[PDB]
Design a protein around this ligand. Structure first.
Ligand SMILES: Nc1nc2[nH]c(CCCc3cc(C(=O)N[C@@H](CCC(=O)O)C(=O)O)cs3)cc2c(=O)[nH]1
Ligand SMILES: NCC(=O)N[C@@H]1O[C@H](COP(=O)([O-])[O-])[C@@H](O)[C@H]1O
Length: 200
């Protein structure tokens, strides 16, 4: 299966996916990396790995649908089968999500359904949980509400900050995102016709 990875920043999740998809038994190949932001470290990581990159600046588009259309054009250019959102921070439009239904995965740094949104660690710390984690899910129109593929729990230590908690949770993200991508790319896991996860 042919994979696009969408990023907005550092790209540690991208790097873990590069490493995993290059293992001999990988059912996935990363063929394009798309950032909505110029000059982020994730682009350097892609270039170092010899993977093509595109920058599609959302600020240059009148609305989400036009921006998503520009992304979709590149996905078609590279005959992409599966999209991974890896630190990509834009909400995607309904029609784009529908087109890619069952083919698009996101990593989120909480145990969904807790702490949806862009500041999950801030929320986890404010709430005072002692266990947080990360989630890979299929992307549905409602943000962070699509079907869960894998999760991993991560402890919150007393005195944690976003810096220390995010660091600990990223170690888990780097395990479950490659594992989830392999499950979907191999056809082991799919989004069922009933909209529920199906393990074949
Ligand atoms: N339809 C849909 N889109 C998705 N995009 C992402 C991946 C991103 C999930 C998130 C983005 C934001 C958000 O508020 N984005 C802002 C910009 C934030 C920023 O400037 O950094 C926006 O898009 O206007 C909060 S969580 C997941 C996901 C999903 O499940 N469904
Ligand atoms: N709303 C999605 C979200 O918060 N994504 C989170 O952004 C970070 C990106 O790190 P990376 O650029 O090093 O992969 C990761 O923690 C990812 O789960």
């Amino acid at each position: 299966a042919r994979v696009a990875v969408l990023i907005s920043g550092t790209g540690s999740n991208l790097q873990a996916l590069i490493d995993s998809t290059r293992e001999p038994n990988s059912s996935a190949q990363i063929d394009i990396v798309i950032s909505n932001k110029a000059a982020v470290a994730g682009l350097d990581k892609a270039e170092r790995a010899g993977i093509p990159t595109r920058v599609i600046n959302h600020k240059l588009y009148k609305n989400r649908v036009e921006f998503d259309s520009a992304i979709d054009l590149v996905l078609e250019e590279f005959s992409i089968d599966i999209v991974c959102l890896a630190g990509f921070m834009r909400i995607l439009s309904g029609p784009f999500v529908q087109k890619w239904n069952g083919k698009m995965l996101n990593i989120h740094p909480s145990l969904l359904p807790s702490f949806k949104g862009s500041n999950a660690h801030e929320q986890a710390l404010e709430t005072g949980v002692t266990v947080t984690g990360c989630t890979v899910h299929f992307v549905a129109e409602d943000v962070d509400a699509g079907q869960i593929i894998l999760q991993e729990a991560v402890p919150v230590k007393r005195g944690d900050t976003v810096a220390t908690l995010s660091e600990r949770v990223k170690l888990a993200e780097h395990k479950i995102f490659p594992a989830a991508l392999q499950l979907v790319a191999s056809g082991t896991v799919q989004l069922g016709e009933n909209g529920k996860i199906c393990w074949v």
